[PDB]
Amino acid sequence: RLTELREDIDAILEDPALEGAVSGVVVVDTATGEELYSRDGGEQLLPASNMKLFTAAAALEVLGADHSFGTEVAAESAPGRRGEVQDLYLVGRGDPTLSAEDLDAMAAEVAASGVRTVRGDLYADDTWFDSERLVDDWWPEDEPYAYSAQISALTVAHGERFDTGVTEVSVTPAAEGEPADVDLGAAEGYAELDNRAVTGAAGSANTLVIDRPVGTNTIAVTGSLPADAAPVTALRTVDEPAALAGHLFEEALESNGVTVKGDVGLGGVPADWQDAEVLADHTSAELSEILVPFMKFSNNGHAEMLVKSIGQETAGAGTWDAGLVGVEEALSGLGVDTAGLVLNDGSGLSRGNLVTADTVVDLLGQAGSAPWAQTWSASLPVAGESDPFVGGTLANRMRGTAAEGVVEAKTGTMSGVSALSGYVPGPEGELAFSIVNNGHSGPAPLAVQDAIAVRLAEYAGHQAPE
Ligand SMILES: [Co+2]
Ligand SMILES: [Co+2]
């Protein structure tokens, strides 16, 4: 059976879509340790979001599956009989899932604790991590997009996917000839609007563009939206996620009948403060639960927040330098051979990252007998599953194949880089595989990857659901 599986993967990898590409492909029976297939297994390749595999494992080792994150509100002393504080501080400690509703509930606590007036200023404190918002070699042109959100200790997560540091922009058509209506979402009165967008004739071509030009906090909307068109909604990032958090907290406070009389900006708790009075707090869910939106949808911001959180835990330093070493050391402590690894970030956005397919599989084996193996496993996309929180980035891949419902695997695509790595359980042993593609010249070789995963599922003794 093994001899023929090698022939089959050989033929699959002979696909025209892999022209000029290097492909690291490694397959291991995780019970025996038997290497079933290996090709360029020790070759160093960009992993794209397969890099999140290393990050997730290290966060579970360093922080633990029980770990949660806090946000709190702090005045120098409690409110008076008059119900007055001076300056107020919103303080974030790396919560990657902090919502607008979470800010409202803390605003309700500030009120219920007897504040009616903030006489001084409101500060957003994100000093728990450094203020290095983006990695060195990330591309400025990617910066308006949610996957390239700025990294902060204090960031507002949008929606049930928990997309951090962004706002939802909605563009609605009006009468033909009238400007389109732009709704900045949460960033209303925070980000600036530059609306050059017109409403086009009914049935005209849609040419609408929503940008944030580099080094500005301005949403620039150009082009035409047809009068008959459906509204356009787009997640766009903001400059200084903490400042937007501070902004939304200001409104949250005011909405809960707390008057803020001064300004909103960045600032850390003075330390001059003998014993700061905590007027509100919030605790995230635990890391094991947070791992699901993180890994299923491949959240870049979560990953980089987890790295800085690892840096804080191992070193007291919310820093890429500190957190990345912490990743490496945790993986080493896990029994992983990190020789072939180059860690430049936690998400895999960086083109400075290198893995090898042998390293990936090594980790997949080591993660399988870790105490946290089940929380880790549950976080991965499941091939062909309809439910977005189950199937994730694999929800519309491998449906009606032997892989559907069985293959748990992490994805990762950029220009010239694609990857699929994970597990294949079955009647004939549980397998770990890594498929890493670099240097191909068109569309990501996703069908080739599906083909391999599918064959392995068949080999593991599975059949397509009908
Ligand atoms: Co506003
Ligand atoms: Co099956």
Swiss-Prot record:
The record's section on Pfam families has: Peptidase_S13
According to the UniProt entry, its GO molecular function terms are:
serine-type D-Ala-D-Ala carboxypeptidase activity
Q: Which GO terms describe its biological process?
A: cell wall organization; peptidoglycan biosynthetic process; proteolysis; regulation of cell shape; response to antibiotic
Write out the pathway annotation from the protein's UniProt entry. Answer: Cell wall biogenesis; peptidoglycan biosynthesis
Q: What class of enzyme is it?
A: hydrolase
Q: What are the record's GO terms for cellular component?
A: extracellular region
Q: Does the keyword Metal-binding apply?
A: no
Locate the active site. S49, K52, S298
Catalysed conversion reaction: Preferential cleavage: (Ac)2-L-Lys-D-Ala-|-D-Ala. Also transpeptidation of peptidyl-alanyl moieties that are N-acyl substituents of D-alanine
Look up the EC number in the record and give it.
Answer: 3.4.16.4
Q: What is its main location?
A: secreted
UniProt activity-regulation remark: Inhibited by benzylpenicillin, cephaloridine, ampicillin and cetiofur.
Q: Which domain of life is it from?
A: Bacteria
**Would the keyword Secreted turn up in this protein's UniProt record?**
yes
The subcellular location is: Secreted
The protein's role, per its UniProt record = Removes C-terminal D-alanyl residues from sugar-peptide cell wall precursors.
Q: Which family does it belong to?
A: Belongs to the peptidase S13 family.
Tell me what this protein is called: D-alanyl-D-alanine carboxypeptidase
Organism of origin is: Actinomadura sp. (strain R39)
